[PDB]
Short mmCIF file of C-alpha atoms and ligand atoms in Angstrom, two decimals:
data_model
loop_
_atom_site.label_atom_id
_atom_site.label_comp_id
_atom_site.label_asym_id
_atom_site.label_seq_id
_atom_site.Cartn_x
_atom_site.Cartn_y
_atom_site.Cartn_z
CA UNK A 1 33.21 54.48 53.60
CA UNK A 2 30.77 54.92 56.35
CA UNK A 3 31.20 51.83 58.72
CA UNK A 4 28.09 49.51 59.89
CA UNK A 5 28.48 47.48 63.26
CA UNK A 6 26.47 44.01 62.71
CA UNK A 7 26.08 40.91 65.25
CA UNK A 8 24.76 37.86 64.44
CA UNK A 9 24.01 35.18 66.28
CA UNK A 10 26.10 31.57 65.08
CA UNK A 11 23.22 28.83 65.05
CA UNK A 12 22.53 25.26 63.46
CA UNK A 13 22.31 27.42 59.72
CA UNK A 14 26.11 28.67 60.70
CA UNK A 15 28.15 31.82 60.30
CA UNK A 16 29.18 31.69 56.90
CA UNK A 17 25.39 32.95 55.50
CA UNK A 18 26.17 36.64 56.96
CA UNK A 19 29.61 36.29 55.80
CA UNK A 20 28.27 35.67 52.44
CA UNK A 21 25.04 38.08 53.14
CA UNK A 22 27.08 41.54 54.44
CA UNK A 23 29.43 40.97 50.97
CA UNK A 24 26.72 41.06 48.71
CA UNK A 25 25.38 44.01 50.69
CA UNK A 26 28.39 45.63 50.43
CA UNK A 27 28.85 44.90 46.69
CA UNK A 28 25.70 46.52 46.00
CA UNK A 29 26.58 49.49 48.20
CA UNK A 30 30.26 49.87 48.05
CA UNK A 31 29.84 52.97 50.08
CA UNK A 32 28.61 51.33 53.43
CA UNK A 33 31.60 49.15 55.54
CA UNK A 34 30.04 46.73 57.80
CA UNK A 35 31.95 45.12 60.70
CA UNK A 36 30.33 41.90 61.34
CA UNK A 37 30.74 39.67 64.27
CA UNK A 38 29.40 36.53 64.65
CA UNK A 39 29.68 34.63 67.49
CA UNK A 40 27.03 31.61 69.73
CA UNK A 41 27.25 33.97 72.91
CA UNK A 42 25.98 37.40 71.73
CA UNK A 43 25.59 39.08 74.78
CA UNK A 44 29.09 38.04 75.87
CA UNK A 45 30.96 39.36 72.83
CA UNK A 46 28.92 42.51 72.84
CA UNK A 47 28.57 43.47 76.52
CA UNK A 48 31.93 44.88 76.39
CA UNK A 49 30.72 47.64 73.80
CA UNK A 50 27.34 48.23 75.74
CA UNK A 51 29.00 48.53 78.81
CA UNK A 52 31.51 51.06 77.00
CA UNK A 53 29.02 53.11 75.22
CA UNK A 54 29.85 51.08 71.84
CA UNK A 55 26.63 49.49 70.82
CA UNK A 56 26.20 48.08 67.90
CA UNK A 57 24.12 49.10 65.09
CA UNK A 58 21.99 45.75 63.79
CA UNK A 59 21.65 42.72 66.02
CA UNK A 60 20.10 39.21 64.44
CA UNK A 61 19.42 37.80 68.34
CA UNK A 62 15.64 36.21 68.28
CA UNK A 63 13.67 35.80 71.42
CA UNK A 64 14.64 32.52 73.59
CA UNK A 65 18.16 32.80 73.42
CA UNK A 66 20.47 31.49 76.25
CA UNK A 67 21.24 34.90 77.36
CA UNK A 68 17.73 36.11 77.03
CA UNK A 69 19.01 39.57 75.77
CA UNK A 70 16.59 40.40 73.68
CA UNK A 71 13.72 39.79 76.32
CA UNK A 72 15.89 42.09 78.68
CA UNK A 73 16.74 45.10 76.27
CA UNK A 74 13.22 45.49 75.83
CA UNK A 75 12.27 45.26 79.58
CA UNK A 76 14.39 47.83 79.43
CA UNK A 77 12.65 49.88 76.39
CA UNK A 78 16.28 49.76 74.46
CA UNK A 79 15.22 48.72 71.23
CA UNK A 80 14.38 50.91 68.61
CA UNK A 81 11.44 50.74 66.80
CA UNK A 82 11.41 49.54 63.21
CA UNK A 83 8.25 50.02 62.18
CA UNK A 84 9.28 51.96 59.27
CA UNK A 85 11.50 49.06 57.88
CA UNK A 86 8.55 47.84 56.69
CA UNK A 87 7.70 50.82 54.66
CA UNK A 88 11.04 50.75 53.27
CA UNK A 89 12.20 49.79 49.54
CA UNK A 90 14.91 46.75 49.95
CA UNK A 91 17.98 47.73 48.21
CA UNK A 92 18.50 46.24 44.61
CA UNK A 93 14.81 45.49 44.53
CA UNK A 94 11.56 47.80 43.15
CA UNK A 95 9.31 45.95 46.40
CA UNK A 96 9.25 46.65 50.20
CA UNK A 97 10.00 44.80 52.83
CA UNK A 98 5.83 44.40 53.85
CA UNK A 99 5.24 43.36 50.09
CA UNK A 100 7.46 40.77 50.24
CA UNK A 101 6.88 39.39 53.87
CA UNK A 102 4.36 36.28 54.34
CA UNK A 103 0.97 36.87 55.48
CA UNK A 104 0.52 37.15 59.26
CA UNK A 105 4.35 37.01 60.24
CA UNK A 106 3.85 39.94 62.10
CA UNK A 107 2.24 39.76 65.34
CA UNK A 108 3.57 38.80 69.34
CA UNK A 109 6.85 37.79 68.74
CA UNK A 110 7.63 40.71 66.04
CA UNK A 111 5.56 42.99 68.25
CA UNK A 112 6.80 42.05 72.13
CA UNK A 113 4.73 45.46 73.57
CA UNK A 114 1.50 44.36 71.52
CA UNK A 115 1.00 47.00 69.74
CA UNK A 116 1.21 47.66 65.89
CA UNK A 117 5.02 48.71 66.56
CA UNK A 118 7.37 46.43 65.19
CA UNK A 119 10.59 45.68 67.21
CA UNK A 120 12.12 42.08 66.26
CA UNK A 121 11.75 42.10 62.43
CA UNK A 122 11.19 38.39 62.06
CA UNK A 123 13.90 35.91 60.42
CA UNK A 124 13.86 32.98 59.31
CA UNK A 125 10.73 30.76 59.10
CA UNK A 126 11.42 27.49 60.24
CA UNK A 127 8.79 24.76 61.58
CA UNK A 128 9.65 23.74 64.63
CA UNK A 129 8.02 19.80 66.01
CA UNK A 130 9.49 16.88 66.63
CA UNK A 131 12.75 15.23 64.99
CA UNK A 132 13.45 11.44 65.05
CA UNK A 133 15.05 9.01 63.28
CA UNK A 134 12.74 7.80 60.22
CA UNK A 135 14.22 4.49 59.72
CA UNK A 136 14.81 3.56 62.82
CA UNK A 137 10.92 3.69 63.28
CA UNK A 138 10.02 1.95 60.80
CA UNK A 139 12.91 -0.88 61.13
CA UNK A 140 10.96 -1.65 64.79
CA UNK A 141 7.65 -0.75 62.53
CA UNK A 142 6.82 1.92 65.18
CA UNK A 143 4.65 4.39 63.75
CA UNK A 144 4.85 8.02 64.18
CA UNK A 145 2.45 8.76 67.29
CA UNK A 146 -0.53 11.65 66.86
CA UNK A 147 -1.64 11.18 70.25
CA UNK A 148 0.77 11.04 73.67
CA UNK A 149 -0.85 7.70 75.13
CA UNK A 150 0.66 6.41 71.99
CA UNK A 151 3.83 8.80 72.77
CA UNK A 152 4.55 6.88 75.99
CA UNK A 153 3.27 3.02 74.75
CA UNK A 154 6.12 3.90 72.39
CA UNK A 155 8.61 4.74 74.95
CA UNK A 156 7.98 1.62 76.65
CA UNK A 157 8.97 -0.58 73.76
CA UNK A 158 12.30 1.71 73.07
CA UNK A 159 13.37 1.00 76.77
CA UNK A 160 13.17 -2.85 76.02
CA UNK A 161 15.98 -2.16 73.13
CA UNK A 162 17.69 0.28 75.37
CA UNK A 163 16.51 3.39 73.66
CA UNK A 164 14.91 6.66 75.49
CA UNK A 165 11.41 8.06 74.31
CA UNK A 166 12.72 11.76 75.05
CA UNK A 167 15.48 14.15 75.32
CA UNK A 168 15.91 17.98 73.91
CA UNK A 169 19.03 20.54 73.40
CA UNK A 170 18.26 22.73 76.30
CA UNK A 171 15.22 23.72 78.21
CA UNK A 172 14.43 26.91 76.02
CA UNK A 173 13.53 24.29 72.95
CA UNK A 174 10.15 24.10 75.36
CA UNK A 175 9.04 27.76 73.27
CA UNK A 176 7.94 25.60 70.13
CA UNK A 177 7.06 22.79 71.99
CA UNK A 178 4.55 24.64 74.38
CA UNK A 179 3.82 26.87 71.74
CA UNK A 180 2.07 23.47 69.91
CA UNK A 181 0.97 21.38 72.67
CA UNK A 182 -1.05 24.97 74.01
CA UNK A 183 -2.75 24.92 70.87
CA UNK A 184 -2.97 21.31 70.37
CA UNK A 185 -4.95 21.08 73.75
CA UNK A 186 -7.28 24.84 74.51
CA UNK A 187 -7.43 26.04 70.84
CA UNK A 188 -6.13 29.06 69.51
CA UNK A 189 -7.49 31.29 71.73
CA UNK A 190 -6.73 29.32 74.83
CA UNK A 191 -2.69 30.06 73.65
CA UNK A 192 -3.37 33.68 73.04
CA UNK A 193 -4.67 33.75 76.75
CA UNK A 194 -1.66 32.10 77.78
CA UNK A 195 0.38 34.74 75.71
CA UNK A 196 -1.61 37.43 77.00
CA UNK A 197 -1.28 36.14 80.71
CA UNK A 198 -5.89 36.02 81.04
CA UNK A 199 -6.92 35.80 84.64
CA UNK A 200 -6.15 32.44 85.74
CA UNK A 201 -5.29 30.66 82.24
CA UNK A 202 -2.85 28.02 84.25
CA UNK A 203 -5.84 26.82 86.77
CA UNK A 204 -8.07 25.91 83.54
CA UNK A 205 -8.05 21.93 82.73
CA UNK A 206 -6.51 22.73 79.59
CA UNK A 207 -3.55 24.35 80.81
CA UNK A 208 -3.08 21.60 83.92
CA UNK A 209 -3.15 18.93 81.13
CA UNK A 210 -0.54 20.50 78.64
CA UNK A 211 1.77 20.48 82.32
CA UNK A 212 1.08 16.71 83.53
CA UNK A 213 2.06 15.96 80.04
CA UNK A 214 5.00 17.25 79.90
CA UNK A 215 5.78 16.29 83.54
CA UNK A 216 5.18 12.35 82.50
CA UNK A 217 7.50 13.45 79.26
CA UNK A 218 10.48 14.33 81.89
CA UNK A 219 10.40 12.48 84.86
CA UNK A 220 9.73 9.38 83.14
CA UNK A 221 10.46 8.91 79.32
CA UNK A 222 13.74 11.20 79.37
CA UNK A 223 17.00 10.41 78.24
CA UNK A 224 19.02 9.98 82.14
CA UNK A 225 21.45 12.79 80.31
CA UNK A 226 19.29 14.98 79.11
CA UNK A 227 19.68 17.73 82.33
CA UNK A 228 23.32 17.03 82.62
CA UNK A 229 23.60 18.32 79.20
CA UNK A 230 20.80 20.88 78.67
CA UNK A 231 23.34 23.73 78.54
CA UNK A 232 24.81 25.98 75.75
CA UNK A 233 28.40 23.91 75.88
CA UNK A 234 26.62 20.63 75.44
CA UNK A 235 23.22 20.68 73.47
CA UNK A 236 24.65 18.95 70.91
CA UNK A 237 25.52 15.87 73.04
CA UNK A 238 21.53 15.33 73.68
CA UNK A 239 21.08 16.02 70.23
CA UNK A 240 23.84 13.58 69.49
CA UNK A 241 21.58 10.51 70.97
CA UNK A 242 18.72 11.16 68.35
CA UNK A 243 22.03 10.11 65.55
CA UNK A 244 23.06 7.79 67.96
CA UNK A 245 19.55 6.02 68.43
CA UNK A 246 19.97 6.26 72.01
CA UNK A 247 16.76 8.42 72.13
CA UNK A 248 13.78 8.79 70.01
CA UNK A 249 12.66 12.37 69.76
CA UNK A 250 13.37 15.72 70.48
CA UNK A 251 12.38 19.50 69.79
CA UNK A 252 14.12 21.10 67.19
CA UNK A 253 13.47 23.10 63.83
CA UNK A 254 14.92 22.89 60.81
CA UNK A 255 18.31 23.85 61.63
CA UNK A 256 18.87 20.64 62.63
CA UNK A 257 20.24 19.06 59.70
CA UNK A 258 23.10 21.62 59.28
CA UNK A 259 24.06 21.69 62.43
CA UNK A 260 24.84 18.07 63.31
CA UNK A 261 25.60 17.31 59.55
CA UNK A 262 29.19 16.54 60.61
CA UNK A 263 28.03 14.01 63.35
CA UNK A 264 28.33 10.77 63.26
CA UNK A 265 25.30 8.46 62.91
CA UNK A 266 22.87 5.34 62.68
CA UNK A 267 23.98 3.04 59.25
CA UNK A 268 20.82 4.53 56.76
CA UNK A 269 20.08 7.24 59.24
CA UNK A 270 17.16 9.30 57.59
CA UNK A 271 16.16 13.10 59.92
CA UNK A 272 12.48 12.62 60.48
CA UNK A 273 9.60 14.95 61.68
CA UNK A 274 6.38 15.39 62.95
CA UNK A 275 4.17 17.69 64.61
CA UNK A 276 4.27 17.57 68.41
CA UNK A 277 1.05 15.18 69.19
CA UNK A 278 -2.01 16.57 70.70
CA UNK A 279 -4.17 14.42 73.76
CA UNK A 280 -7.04 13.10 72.13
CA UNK A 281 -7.11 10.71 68.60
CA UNK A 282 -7.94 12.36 66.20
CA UNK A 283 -7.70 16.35 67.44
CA UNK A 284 -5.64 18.54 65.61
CA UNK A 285 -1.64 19.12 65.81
CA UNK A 286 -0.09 22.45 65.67
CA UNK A 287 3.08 22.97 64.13
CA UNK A 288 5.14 26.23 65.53
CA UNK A 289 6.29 28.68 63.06
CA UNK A 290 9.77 29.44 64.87
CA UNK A 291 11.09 33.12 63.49
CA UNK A 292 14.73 34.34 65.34
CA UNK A 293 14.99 38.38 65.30
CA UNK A 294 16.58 41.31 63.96
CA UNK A 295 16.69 44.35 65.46
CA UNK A 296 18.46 47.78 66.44
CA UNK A 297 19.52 48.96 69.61
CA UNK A 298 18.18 52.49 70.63
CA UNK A 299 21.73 53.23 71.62
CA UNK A 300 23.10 52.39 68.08
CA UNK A 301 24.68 55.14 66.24
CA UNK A 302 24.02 54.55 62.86
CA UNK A 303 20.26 53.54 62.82
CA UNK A 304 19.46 54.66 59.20
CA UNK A 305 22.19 52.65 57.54
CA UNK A 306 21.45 49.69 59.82
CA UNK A 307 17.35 49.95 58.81
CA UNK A 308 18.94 50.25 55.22
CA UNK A 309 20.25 46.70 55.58
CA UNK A 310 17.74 45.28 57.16
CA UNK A 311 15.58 45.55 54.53
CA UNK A 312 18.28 43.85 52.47
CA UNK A 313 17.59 41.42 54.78
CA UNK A 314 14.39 40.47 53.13
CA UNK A 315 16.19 40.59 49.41
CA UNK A 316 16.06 37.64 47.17
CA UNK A 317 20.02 37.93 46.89
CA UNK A 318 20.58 37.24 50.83
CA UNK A 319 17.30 34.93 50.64
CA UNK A 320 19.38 32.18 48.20
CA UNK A 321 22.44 32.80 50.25
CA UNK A 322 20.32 31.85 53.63
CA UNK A 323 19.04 28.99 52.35
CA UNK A 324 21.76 27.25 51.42
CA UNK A 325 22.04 25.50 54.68
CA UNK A 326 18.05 25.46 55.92
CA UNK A 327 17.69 29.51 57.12
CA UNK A 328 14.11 30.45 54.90
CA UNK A 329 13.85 34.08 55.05
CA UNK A 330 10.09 34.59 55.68
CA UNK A 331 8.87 35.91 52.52
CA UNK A 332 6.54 35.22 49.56
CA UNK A 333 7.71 32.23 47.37
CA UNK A 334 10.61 31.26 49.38
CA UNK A 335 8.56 27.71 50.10
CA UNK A 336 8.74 27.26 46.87
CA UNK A 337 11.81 24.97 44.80
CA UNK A 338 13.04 24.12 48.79
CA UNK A 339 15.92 22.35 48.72
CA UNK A 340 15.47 18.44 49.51
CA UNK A 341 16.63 18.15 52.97
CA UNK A 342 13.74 20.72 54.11
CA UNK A 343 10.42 18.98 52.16
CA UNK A 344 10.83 16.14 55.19
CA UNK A 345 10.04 19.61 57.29
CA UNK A 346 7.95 21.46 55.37
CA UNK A 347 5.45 18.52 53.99
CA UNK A 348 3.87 18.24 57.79
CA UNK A 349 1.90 21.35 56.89
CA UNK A 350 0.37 18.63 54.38
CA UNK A 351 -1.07 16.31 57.25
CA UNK A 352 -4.67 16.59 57.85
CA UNK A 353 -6.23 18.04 60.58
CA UNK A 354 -2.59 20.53 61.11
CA UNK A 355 -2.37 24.00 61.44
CA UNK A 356 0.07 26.60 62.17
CA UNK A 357 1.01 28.22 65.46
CA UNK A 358 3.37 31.16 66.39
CA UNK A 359 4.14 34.29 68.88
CA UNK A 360 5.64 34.04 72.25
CA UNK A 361 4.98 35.64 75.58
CA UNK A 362 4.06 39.47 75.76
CA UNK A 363 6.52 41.80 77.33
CA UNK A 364 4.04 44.58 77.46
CA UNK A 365 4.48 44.35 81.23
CA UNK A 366 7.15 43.04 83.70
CA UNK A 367 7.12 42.42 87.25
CA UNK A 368 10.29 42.38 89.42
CA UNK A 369 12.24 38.86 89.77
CA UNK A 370 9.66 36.70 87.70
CA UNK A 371 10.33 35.77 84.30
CA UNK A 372 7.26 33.37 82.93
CA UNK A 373 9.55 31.79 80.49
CA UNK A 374 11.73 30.52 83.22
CA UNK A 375 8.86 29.39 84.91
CA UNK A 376 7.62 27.41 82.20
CA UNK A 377 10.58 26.21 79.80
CA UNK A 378 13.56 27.13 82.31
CA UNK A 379 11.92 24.92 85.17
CA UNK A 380 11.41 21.52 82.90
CA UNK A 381 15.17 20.81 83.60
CA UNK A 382 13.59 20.97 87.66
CA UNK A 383 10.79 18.87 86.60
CA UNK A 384 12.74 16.53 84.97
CA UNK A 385 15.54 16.15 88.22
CA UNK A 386 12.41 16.10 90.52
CA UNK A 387 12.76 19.07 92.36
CA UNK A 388 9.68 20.56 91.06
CA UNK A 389 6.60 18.81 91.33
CA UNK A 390 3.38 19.31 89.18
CA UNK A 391 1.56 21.65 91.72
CA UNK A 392 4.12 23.64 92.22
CA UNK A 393 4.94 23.67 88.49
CA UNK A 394 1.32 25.09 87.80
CA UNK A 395 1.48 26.95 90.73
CA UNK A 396 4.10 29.16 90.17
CA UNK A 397 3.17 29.92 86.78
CA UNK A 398 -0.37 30.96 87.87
CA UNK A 399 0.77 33.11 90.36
CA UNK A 400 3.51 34.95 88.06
CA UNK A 401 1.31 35.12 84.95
CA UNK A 402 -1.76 36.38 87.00
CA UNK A 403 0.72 39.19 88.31
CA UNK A 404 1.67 40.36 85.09
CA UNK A 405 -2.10 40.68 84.14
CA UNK A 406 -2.14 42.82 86.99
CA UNK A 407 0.63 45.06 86.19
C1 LIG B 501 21.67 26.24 72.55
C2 LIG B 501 21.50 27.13 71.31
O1 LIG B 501 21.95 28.22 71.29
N1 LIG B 501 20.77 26.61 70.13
C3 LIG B 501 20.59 27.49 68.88
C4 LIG B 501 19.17 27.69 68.67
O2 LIG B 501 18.63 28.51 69.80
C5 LIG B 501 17.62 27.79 70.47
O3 LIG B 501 16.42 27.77 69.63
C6 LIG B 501 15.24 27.08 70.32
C7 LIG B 501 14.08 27.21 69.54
O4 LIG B 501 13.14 26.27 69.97
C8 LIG B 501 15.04 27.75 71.72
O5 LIG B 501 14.58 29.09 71.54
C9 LIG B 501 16.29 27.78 72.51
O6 LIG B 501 16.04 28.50 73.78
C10 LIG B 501 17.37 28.44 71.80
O7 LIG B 501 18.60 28.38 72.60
C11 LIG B 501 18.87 28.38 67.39
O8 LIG B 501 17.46 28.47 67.24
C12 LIG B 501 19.47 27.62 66.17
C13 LIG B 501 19.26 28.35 64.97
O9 LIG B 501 19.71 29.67 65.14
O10 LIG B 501 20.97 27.46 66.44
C14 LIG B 501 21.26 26.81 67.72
O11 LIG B 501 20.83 25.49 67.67
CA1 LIG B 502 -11.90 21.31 80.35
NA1 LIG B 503 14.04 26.43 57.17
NA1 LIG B 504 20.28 22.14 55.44
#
């Protein structure tokens, strides 16, 4: 009867789970219609509507996309908030949605403003680290490196078998991967500084070091067509040389597997991972909690049907339907029984001396053209073609997070 506009984003976990999700919804409300569109360039099949009035009601877009639309809309204060979601009973179920949600998922990244309003009601819950090739390690008995000295001894060997260290989708796969190596180096509260854009975080040693890193990472130990393919069309081609064993690792989360499940591979190819490693032996590795994002315009129409289905959302109905290919919804229990091609994920929490990182940048403030994730994940793809240098890497990013402490 009364019609529901949905968009969903198409990633590595596929199309087919909302599919699958909005017909269960509807079976359990036959009175609500929902038009869903899925598609891997949101803004681009829904700019038409916003640009026409026609917004749509519920939008699964996390932060980090290629469009960066959710980062915009709320620069621009034009999502609603969904703080009341989590008051709200989930349809078919006696529990609501805050009952059944993990501990702690709320915070930055749910949260952009910083506040106790939630705007991006988090989905999934997916480690994010490096992936690699397990037996292709351990055929050239290369262990798994903790440490980056061992990182780049490694890459040295792989070059004399023709095989690159490094390589990654696209640039924006630097969220998770600064998100760890941030923690791995200051601490938690050195990466909540960072987050929080403290006076002069990017002069301290600790931010310098997680930068020359990364810049020895890129300009060194990268696969040569990494930057030629760090783009939306071909992402899949870097990720392609991880099956291929033309490169070693990469950043990625558990989508992984379902998304390149149709690739061709290694003989006895086995997905590997592994925390991002830290600087010193022995110091401890952070694994990134990587949640996407649902949320409702504050142009939508029909908010109170939309919050109604968000909440189914967090049901154990669309749960089992998510996980069929990797998506975890993040609530209680849902680690448990995990299907097999996740424990290789999952069991990392198990290492010693590992702990769990998550949030992203805070958009309580923006300043006019400057955009701190370009700066720092958008400008590795300069790094690593050697127009950017390590100065002016750190540079830049002091001078754009120091203005947004300012504003
Ligand atoms: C190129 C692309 O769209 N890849 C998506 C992926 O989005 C990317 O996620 C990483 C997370 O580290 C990063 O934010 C990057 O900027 C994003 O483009 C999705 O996370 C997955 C699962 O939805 O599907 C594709 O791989
Ligand atoms: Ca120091
Ligand atoms: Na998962
Ligand atoms: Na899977």
């Amino acid at each position: 009867k009364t019609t529901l506009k949905f968009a969903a984003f198409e990633g590595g976990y596929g199309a087919d789970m909302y599919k699958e999700v909005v017909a269960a919804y509807e079976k359990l409300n036959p009175d609500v219609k929902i038009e869903l569109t899925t598609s891997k360039k949101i803004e681009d099949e829904i700019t038409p509507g916003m640009k026409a009035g026609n917004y749509p009601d519920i939008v699964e877009l996390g932060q980090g996309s290629t469009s960066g639309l959710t980062e915009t809309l709320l620069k621009d204060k034009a999502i609603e908030d969904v703080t009341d979601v989590l008051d709200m009973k989930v349809p078919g179920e006696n529990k609501t949605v805050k009952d059944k949600l993990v501990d702690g998922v709320i915070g930055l990244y749910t949260n952009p403003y910083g506040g106790d309003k939630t705007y991006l009601m988090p989905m999934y819950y997916s480690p994010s680290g490096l992936v690699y090739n397990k037996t292709l390690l351990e055929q050239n008995g290369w262990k798994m490196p903790t440490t980056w000295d061992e990182m780049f001894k490694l890459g040295d060997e792989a070059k004399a078998k023709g095989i690159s260290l490094f390589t990654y989708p696209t640039a924006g796969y630097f969220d998770a991967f600064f998100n760890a190596l941030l923690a791995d180096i200051g601490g938690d509260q050195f990466y909540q500084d960072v987050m929080t854009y403290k006076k002069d975080v990017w002069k301290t040693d600790e931010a310098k070091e997680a930068l020359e890193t990364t810049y020895k990472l890129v300009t060194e130990y990268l696969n040569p067509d990494t930057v030629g393919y760090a783009n939306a069309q071909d992402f899949t081609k870097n990720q392609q040389s991880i099956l291929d064993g033309k490169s070693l690792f990469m950043p990625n989360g558990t989508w992984i597997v379902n998304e390149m499940k149709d690739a061709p591979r290694t003989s006895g190819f086995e997905w590997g991972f592994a925390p991002v490693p830290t600087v010193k032996n022995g110091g401890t590795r952070y694994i990134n909690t990587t949640i996407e994002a649902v949320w409702i315009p504050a142009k939508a129409k029909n908010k109170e049907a939309a919050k109604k289905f968000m909440a189914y959302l967090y049901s154990d109905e669309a749960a089992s339907i998510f996980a069929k290919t990797g998506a975890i919804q993040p609530i209680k229990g849902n680690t448990d029984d995990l299907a097999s091609d996740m424990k290789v994920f999952y069991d990392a929490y198990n290492e010693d001396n590992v702990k769990a990182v998550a949030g992203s940048f805070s958009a309580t403030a923006t300043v006019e053209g400057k955009n701190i994730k370009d700066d720092l994940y958008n400008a590795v793809d300069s790094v690593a073609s050697g127009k950017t240098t390590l100065q002016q890497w750190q540079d830049k990013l002091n001078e754009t997070s120091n203005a947004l402490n300012a504003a």
